[PDB]
Structure formats: C-alpha cells, structure tokens
Structure 1
Amino acid sequence: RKQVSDGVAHIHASFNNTIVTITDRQGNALGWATAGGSGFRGSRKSTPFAAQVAAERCADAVKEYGIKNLEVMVKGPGPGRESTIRALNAAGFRITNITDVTPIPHNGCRPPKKRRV
C-alpha cells in the first residue's frame, strides 16, 4: 500500500463515453474510471450524470492513493465537462490550472466523410 500526494487528473470526454484518469506529477497512472464501467450503455454512457458517477469512482480510487492536491485537464468534444469536474469538487481538492487540451490540428490530415443522414 502506497501513499503519495501530487495529482494530475485527465478528463477524456466523447459523445459515446467519458473516461477519467488520475496520474502522479510524472503522468504515471494511479487509477481510473469511465462511464461505461460505471455501467451505463448506449445513450446513458454519454450523459453528465454518468460523467459525475465516473468522477466519484476515481475519487474513491485516489482516496487510497492521494487526495491533498490535483491539477485537472480536459480533452475530447463530449458532454459533462462541468458535471465531472464538480464531481472532483466532491472530496474537493485545491486546484488552479484550467484550460482544455483538446487536439486542434494546424490544418492536419483528411477527416472522415460526412454521414448520408
């Protein structure tokens, strides 16, 4: 059993799913949760509620590893950003850096074709 505290939190949100993972300052994963592992499937898997629940599951995993400090970064286009990070405010940490780190290309390679719908 290991106790450390310096914490980086990554929110990886998409219109199918939201993964959340906690890492050390090194970026080394301490533990993680998703929505789909929270148990929701199809439509429920991508909901602000499922993203809160995923954050609660991570909050439990870090209670075992580290809880004093966190630096939270957010990625992917999906819903529930606010919902999952306010769920990190549950068992609240002292955090101040927020931006997205959503990948924007400087005119990178050809995206998929549009859906015929």
Structure 2
Amino acid sequence: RKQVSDGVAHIHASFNNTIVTITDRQGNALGWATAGGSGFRGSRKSTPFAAQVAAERCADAVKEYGIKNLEVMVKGPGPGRESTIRALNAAGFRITNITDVTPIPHXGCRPPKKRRV
C-alpha cells in the first residue's frame, strides 16, 4: 500500500532468538520476522543462519512499502547481529546507518543470580 522508502531496521539479538522489525523513521512497525518463526527451534533458533533467514523474511514482508534505504539498530549480545545486517544489505536495501542500541544501566537494577550448572 503506502510508500515510505526510508525505513529503520531493529534487530533484537538475544542469546536465544533473533527478532527483526522494520519500521518507518517515526517508529511504526511495517513488518517483522523472527528466527524462531522462520523454521527453527531450540539449537537452530540461536544461530546466525536462522537470524539471516529471519531478516530475509522481514525484507520480503515489507516489500509492498517500496523501502529503499535502511537504518540499522542492533540491540543485544546474541549470535544474530552481524548476519542480519549482511542479509539486509543483500536483500536489496541501501544500508545508510548502523548503530548499536544495547541498553546499558549506569550503575541500575540488581541482575538475577548466577546459574550453578
């Protein structure tokens, strides 16, 4: 439907999953995809290949907005950070920006306890 052509790509890259969301520059989600919804569970969901496929799919989903030039917000420590941007550049977008937006507390709240495994 509508035409925007200047989007923002948000990559939420956790240890367990990767979520790719494309919005306009004002924050409105045009489309999204996830590694865990792109045909990958458990040991496969948390790999850079599953994130690449998720980013493929999210590019394929926002096709009918004619998005042409993308900004990239990367958030989180997970495997799917680099691969997602390498697949956004491939899918057809002109990546104009790459920022890390991982939230860092300046102290903040007490984290959960250490796992004993």
TM-score range, shorter chain: over 0.9
Q: Is the 8 A contact 2:74 2:99 kept in 1?
A: yes
Structure 2 residue 55 is matched with structure 1 residue 55? yes
Query: Structure 1 or 2: larger strand share?
Result: 2
Name the counterpart of 2:107: 107
- Asked if 2 retains the 8 angstrom alpha-carbon contact of 1:21 and 1:32, the reply is yes
Cα distance in structure 2, aligned partners of 1:95 and 1:88: 8
Aligned-partner SS, 2:37: coil
Residue of structure 2 in register with 1:69 after alignment? 69
Contact 2:13 2:81 in 1 (8 A): yes
Root-mean-square deviation (CA, aligned residues, Å) is 1.1
TM-score, scaled relative to structure 1:
0.94
Provide, for residues 28-52 of structure 1, a one-character-per-residue CA deviation record: whole Å limited to 9, x for no partner. Answer: 0000000011021111111000000
Contact 1:7 1:66 in 2 (8 A): no
Partners of 1:4 and 1:59 in 2: CA distance: 14
Write the deviation string for residues 64-95 of structure 1: whole angstroms up to 9, x where unpaired.
22321111110011112111111001233222
Distance in 1 between residues matched to 2:65 and 2:116, nearest whole Å: 48
- Of 6-15 and 58-67, more deviation after overlay is shown by 58-67
Bigger mean CA offset, 38-47 vs 93-102: 93-102
Instruction: State the distance in 2 between where 1:103 and 1:18 align.
Output: 16
The answer as to whether partners of 1:4 and 1:66 remain within 8 angstroms in 2 is yes
1:27 is displaced (CA, Å) by 0.7
| Alignment size in residue pairs | 117
Fraction of identical pairs, as percent: 99
* Gap regions ≥5 residues in structure 2: none
Instruction: Give ranges in structure 1 of 5+ residues lacking alignment.
Output: none
2:7 matches 1:18: no
* Farther-moved stretch of structure 1 (30-39 vs 94-103): 94-103
State the 1:4 CA deviation.
2.2
